[PDB]
């Protein structure tokens, strides 16, 4: 199957230009759009449920009827009932149903798709790539237990999340190690310190594309399922390249 | 080392119009410079030694000086040589010195680098990727006994000559077959029909950059140690991506 190009919708005429925004990443190749309207990044704005639920859900029920997947990025299980009710197919969480473990009940209630992201504080007793998988694999499980299918539950290392450059460094070189949990795995550094780190020099945030690009080639050729970007013509006419490779390539051995 | 980006200058005022561009290639990230004046497909022109030269001369003599290396696409040991007493810095052979055997002993004479792709009429007895390693090892072996360094000579497997849409397929998957040779292979499918093949549905060769791209980074993850492209920007910047991702897994591995 093809690599899932997941475009970024954020929510932060609203309604319209968000239409108009999920319109374009359809026709220049998205399978996912994810909305969100809350970060978990240290110095992230404080955005109530209230706040959440009011930015998010005139938009989901505006573009959850076209013909492309909905991912919700929140860590809330109200928010996320509402936007299941409405029909969104996945919920992306950023800390993976440990800030609210009602959320895999929830999930599993309306048969949708889980995307748990590794997260933090940057603390840790173990090396980050066995600590990441360690409690990724656990909540994975506890995802299970609720009875979310094994399929249907995505990791996201977190790049830009818990962990120093060296450590983020550790996690790119050994993306191999996460996707053989065979959970589908969801790669995320668009744009990101990760991207900054590959310039090696100052850039705009649009000047990192390429960059980000190449993480999708490479993830893609370390078998990441999904890639999560800004850029979505760039990323989904690379990763239509990549997907054509790695078959021609496959089919000929 | 970084994989090297060959931008291509194609040549048909014409100096001053072939400065400023290869002033733009250098800004992009350009290693080194193609120029050419002569195809060697069916689907091509014929041109004369002295018709050749008229071209070729007066750009190279104009663009040497630059801060850049210089190729010279040619089969003639002619043009080959009075481009190498000016300084270019390679010879790329379209003909792999089959059609001028005077051309191992040139490059040998001065110092210089060659690339040998392998091209042909379509007809072999041997299935393609082992005709095109009996080839072009044995042009290789020929330009050894020049006195030609190994590390100076190249191999380029010609996607866009001698092969059907399969055998090309067949190549294309078989990248590392060519770069365990352990000469430094180059890459070049830049909008070419394999590229066009990639995209599917109809594109003008411009809309190819990005699956050329995809090519670039696939083939840089198999070894390949230069890429000839339209686009320098985009694939300089893709490549130095996954020239940073390989040498960052290879570190912490």
């Known amino acids: 199957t093809k690599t899932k190009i997941m475009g970024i919708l954020n929510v932060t005429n609203n309604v319209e230009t968000a239409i108009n925004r999920v319109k374009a990443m359809i026709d220049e190749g998205a399978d996912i759009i994810d909305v969100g309207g809350v970060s978990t990044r240290p110095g992230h704005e404080m955005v109530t449920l209230e706040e959440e639920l009011n930015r998010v859900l005139p938009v989901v029920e505006a573009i959850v009827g076209f013909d492309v997947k909905i991912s919700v990025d929140t860590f809330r299980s109200e928010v996320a009932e509402a936007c299941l009710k409405l029909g969104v197919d996945m919920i992306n969480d950023q800390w993976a149903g440990l800030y609210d473990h009602r959320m895999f009940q929830i999930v599993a209630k309306y048969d949708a798709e889980i995307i748990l992201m590794h997260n933090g504080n940057g603390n840790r007793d173990e090396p980050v790539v066995e600590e990441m998988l360690t409690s990724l694999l656990a909540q994975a499980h506890q995802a299970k237990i609720a009875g979310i299918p094994s399929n249907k539950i995505w990791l996201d290392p977190g790049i830009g999340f818990a962990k120093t450059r060296n450590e983020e460094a550790e996690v ?44 999708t080639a490479y993830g893609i ?33």
């Open 221 to 253: 050729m370390k078998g990441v399922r999904a890639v999560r970007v800004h850029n979505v013509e760039l990323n989904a006419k690379l990763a239509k390249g990549i997907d054509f490779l790695k078959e021609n390539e496959n089919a000929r051995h």
């Open 172 to 215: 790119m070189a050994r993306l191999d190690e996460l996707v053989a949990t065979e959970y589908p795995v969801l790669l995320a550094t668009s744009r990101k310190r990760f991207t900054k780190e590959m310039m090696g020099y100052d850039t705009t945030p649009v000047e990192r594309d390429e960059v980000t690009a190449a993480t």
